[PDB]
Amino acid sequence: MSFVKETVDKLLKGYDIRLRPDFGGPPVCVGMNIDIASIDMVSEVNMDYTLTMYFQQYWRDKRLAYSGIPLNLTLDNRVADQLWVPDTYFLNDKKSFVHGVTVKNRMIRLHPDGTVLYGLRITTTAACMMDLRRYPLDEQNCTLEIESYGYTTDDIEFYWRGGDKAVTGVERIELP
């Protein structure tokens, strides 16, 4: 029972938060999943739409590999402040935040193979154009654009985890 504390401490010990996984090695592969909750507002005047979602990022880091307890350890949110995470950001986010009631909506789960599954509950007012030349007989195409800030393809690689099933929750959406 107490051994898990020493296990997680040894996992933390030696970790360099300022260094990406496999710094000299090939680029780290980061899969992503988006569980949509709802799109409450779509403003044509402001040219944007508010979207709420669960953003999962899954990446393989060898520095956090433990043994002797194959149970997938789900840690508290605060550990996210003491670990390396991707610099992923949305290009279109006019204004966005992470929900913080009762505590910060965040989760990390270190599976025994060293991988990490970061999770965030994110609301974002993404900027979308709407060609109103045919309004109200019009059809809109609105896109969320996920991109890395500083790291290039030689350092970090993005892919959709699960192929076409990466995004799950589109059917849950409904608009007036």
Partner: nanobody
């Protein structure tokens, strides 16, 4: 063959509704799902490109079109409905107010 499902009552509170299948000696398996708007669908990989689902107004708002039947498809198919804020579609336990299974034998 066109399977139909009619939902009566407070149908608005249970927007997403779907189809499951079960053969004798087997457990329920997800076949497909349709949402309130009707412009979005969800199908399992095993029934991709063959079975389709559509929504209509009024009462019978769930229609399942079956194509390219196979002997493994011999089963009883259940209509089911789910609440708005509930888990994933694939898992049957999230569903409530189950329907009466219709038996189809190829």
């Amino acid at each position: 063959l066109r399977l139909s499902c009619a939902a009566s009552g407070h149908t608005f509170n249970y927007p997403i509704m779907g189809w499951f299948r079960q053969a004798p000696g087997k457990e329920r398996e997800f076949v497909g799902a349709i949402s309130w708007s009707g412009g979005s669908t969800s199908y399992a990989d095993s029934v991709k490109d063959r079975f389709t689902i559509s929504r209509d107004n009024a009462k019978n708002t769930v229609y399942l079109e079956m194509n390219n039947l196979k002997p493994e498809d011999t089963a009883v198919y259940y209509c089911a409905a789910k609440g708005r804020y509930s888990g994933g579609l694939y898992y049957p336990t999230n569903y409530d107010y189950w329907g009466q299974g219709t038996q189809v034998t190829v």
